[PDB]
Structure 1
Amino acid sequence: KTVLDANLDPLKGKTIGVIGYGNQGRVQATIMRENGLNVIVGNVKDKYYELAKKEGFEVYEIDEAVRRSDVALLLIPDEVMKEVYEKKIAPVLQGKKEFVLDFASGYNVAFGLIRPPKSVDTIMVAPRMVGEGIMDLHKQGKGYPVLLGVKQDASGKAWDYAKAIAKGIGAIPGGIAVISSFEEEALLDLMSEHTWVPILFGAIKACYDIAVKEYGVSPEAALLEFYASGELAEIARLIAEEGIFNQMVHHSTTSQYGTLTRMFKYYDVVRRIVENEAKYIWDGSFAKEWSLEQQAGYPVFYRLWELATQSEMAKAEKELYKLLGR
C-alpha cells in the first residue's frame, strides 16, 4: 500500500523555493538541483548563508524567496519555525493564487501552531534516515524511505505534488514512500523519544546504581559491560539487516533464554508506560507544556541537565574516557 514511482512534470518547469540551508538544506537542495529543478535558497544572513553561496546557489532573504517561489519547502528547525512563519511568510501568503507549502516536521502543523490559509495546499515529506547517509546513498544509487501526507488539499493536485517531490529529492526509486497523515508523523516522531529511549537510558542508569551501590562492583567495571565497550552498537547493527528477533540466532543459547523469558514477562509492565504516553501526545497535551517551557525560559530543561551531568554514572565515564584514549 506504498508508492514507488511517479511523475516529475508537476513540480517541473516552475521554481521551487527552499527555506533554510541547515541539516536538510545542505542535503536536500543539491539533489533537487540535480533533477533539473530551479531551486532558490532562502536564509537570513548568518554562517549558513555562506555555505549556500559557497556551493553554487542563488540565495536571498527568507521572506523574499517565497515571493519568487512556486513550490515552497520549509527546512528549518521546529522551535524557531512558528515565529518565522508568522513574521515572514504570513504577510506574503495573501498574494498567492495557487501555492503548495511543504513541511518536513509534523509537530508544528498537527497541533495547530501553524495554520496555513485555504489557497496554500500544505503537505509533508519526512525522510527516514540519519541525514548523514543520504549523500552516501545518493552516491551509491539507492534511495531512502519517506513519509508522505496531505493536510489541506484545496486544488486536487496534492498527490500530484506529494509524490513528485519524493521523486525529486531522490527518495524513490530505491526507497519507498508511505502515505500517511500529519498526525501520525507527529506521533511516531515523539512517542519514540518518549517511550523507548528514556526507558532505555533510565534502565542503564538503574543498572549502574544497583550494581555499584549494593553488589560492590567496581565503578570502572560496570561501565565496560553496559555501554563503554561496544555491545549496544553491536546489538544495533544486526537489527538493521536481519530483523529484531532474527539477530538473536547469533547469540549464545543462554542469552536467548533469559531475554525471551523476560521480554514476555515485562511486556505488560511496559505497555502501561507506553499507552499512557501515547494518549498524552494525542491530546495535544505535550505540545502545550513544551510551548510553556520556552516562554518560562527553560528552568526545568536547565536543572535536568545539571542533574544529569553531575550523576555518578556521568562522572565515572569522564575519567574512563581519559583512560581509553577517547
Structure 2
Amino acid sequence: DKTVLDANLDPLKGKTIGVIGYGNQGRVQATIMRENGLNVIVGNVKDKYYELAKKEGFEVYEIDEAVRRSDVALLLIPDEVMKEVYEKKIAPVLQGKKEFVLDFASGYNVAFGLIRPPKSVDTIMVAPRMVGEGIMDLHKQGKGYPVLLGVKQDASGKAWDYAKAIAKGIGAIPGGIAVISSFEEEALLDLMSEHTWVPILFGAIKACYDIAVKEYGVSPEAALLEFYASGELAEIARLIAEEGIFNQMVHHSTTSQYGTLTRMFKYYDVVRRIVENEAKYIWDGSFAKEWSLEQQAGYPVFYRLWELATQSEMAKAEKELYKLLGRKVK
C-alpha cells in the first residue's frame, strides 16, 4: 500500500542543497548527489574532515553561511549534538527564511521534542537502512537500497514532492524501495533494536560461558570457538538476509532444527514481557530523560560499564586466544 519506488527529480533542478556534516555519512549522500549533477555545498567545523573535504572541490563554508546560501540541507550530524548546533547557530537564522526545508537522518531529536523548528518551515526524514559505506560498494553497480520517509510539518503543500524526490538523488531509487513512515516510528525501530535483541544476544553468550566454565568444567579456549569466534554468526546472517529467516534452516540438520523451534515458542512469552516493558519506556519519552541527563553529569555510568565488560572473565580469556591465533585485535 505505502510502497514507493519512483519519483521525479524535477523539483530540485533550480534549488541549492547544503550538505551538513562530512562524517562517514556525508561523504556518501553528497557524492552520489554530486555525480548526479546538482549544485551542492558543504558545511562543517574545521578539522581533518574539512582538509579532506577541501581536497575535493566542495564549496565548504561555515555552517550558518551555508544555511543562508542554500535552500535545503541534510543535517547529517549525530543524534547527540544536533541540539546544541540548532539552538546556538542555525535556528536564529531560519526566521530569516520564508521558503526552506531541513532534512534529517535520525529522528531521535524530533519525535521526542528535543528540537522544535518553526511553522514557516518544512521538516522531513530520509533514513538509509544500510551500513552506509556498503552503499558506495554497491551504488557503482546501479543497484539502490531502502530508505524511510516522514513528515512533521508541511507549511508549503509540497513536502512529499521534496522527500520523494530527494531519495532519487542519493542512490536509493529507482532501483530499490522507499517506505513511508513518521519520525515517531523512525526512532522506535532504530532504538528497539539497540535495546531488545542486541543485548539479549550478548547477555546469553555471557551466560552460556559463565555456566559452561564455572559450573560444568569446560576449557575456556573451546567455549569461545563454538559461540562467537567461528563463522556461525558471520554466515547465519548472510543466509537470513538472502533466503528467509524461517527458510535458511533446511541447510542445517534436524538436530539443529528441532531444538530451535521447540524452544523458540517456549520463550516467546518471556521476551514479549521484556519488549513490551522496553517499548513503553520509549514511547513515553522516558529514555531521553535518561540519556539527556547522562550527558550533563559527565558520563559516570557509561564510563563504568566499559570497565566491567572489558575486565570480565570472558574478555580476559578471549583477548589471549586471539593472541594465540593472530587476529587484528586490542
Which category of TM-score, normalised to the shorter sequence, fits these structures?
Answer: over 0.9
* Corresponding residue of 1:214: 215
SS at match of 1:147: strand
Map Cα deviations across residues 89-128 of structure 1 (whole Å, 9 max, x no partner). 0121111011011000110111011100011100000001
- Counterpart-to-counterpart distance in 2, 1:50 and 1:243: 44
Bigger mean CA offset, 286-295 vs 55-64: 55-64
**Equivalents in 1 of 2:231, 2:74: separation in Å?**
39
Give the total of aligned pairs.
Answer: 326
Aligned counterparts of 2:120 and 2:48: Cα–Cα separation in 1: 34
Q: Distance in 1 between matches of 2:7 and 2:120?
A: 24
Give the distance between the partners of 1:73 and 1:236, measured in 2 at CA.
Answer: 31
- Alpha-carbon separation, structure 1, partners of 2:149 and 2:37: 22
Extract unaligned runs of 5+ from structure 1. none
- The answer to which of 57-66 and 186-195 deviates more is 57-66
SS class of match (1:17): strand
1:188: which partner in 2?
189
Q: How far apart are 1:170 and its partner, in Å? A: 1.3
Cα contact 1:223–1:317 (8 A) shared by 2 = yes
SS at match of 1:41: strand
Structure 2: 5+ residue stretches without partners: none
**Alpha-carbon separation, structure 1, partners of 2:141 and 2:325:** 34
Shift in Å, 1:3: 0.7
Cα root mean square deviation, aligned? 0.8
Q: CA deviation at 1:309?
A: 0.4
Q: CA deviation at 1:158?
A: 0.4
TM-fit CA distance, 1:277? 0.4
Distance in 2 between residues matched to 1:163 and 1:34, nearest whole Å: 19
Post-superposition offset of 1:34: 1.7
Q: Is the partner of 2:19 in helix, strand or coil?
A: strand
Deviations 1:182-229 (CA, angstroms, capped at 9, x unpaired): 100000000000000010000111100000001100010100011011
Q: Distance in 2 between matches of 1:295 and 1:33?
A: 39
CA distance in 2, matches of 1:122, 1:289: 26
Q: Which segment drifts farther, 253-262 or 43-52?
A: 43-52
Alpha-carbon shift at residue 174 of structure 1 (Å): 1.3
- TM-score, reference length from structure 1: 0.99
**Distance of 1:48 and 1:84 partners within structure 2:** 18
How far is the alpha carbon of 1:248 from its aligned partner? 0.4
Question: Would the aligned equivalents of 1:12 and 1:36 in 2 still touch at CA under 8 Å?
Answer: no
Query: Segments of 4+ in structure 1 off by > 6 A?
Result: none
1: CA distance, partners of 2:6 / 2:243: 26
CA contact 1:11–1:71 (8 Å) conserved in 2: no
Is the 1:44–1:60 contact (alpha carbons within 8 Å) kept by the matching residues of 2? no
State the alpha-carbon separation in 2 of the partners of residues 166 and 288 from structure 1: 33
- Superposed displacement of residue 285, structure 1: 0.3
After TM superposition, the structure 1 stretch with the greater mean CA deviation from structure 2, 10-19 or 158-167, is 10-19
How far apart are residue 132 of structure 1 and its match?
Answer: 1.4
**d(CA) in 2 for partners of 1:258, 1:217:** 22
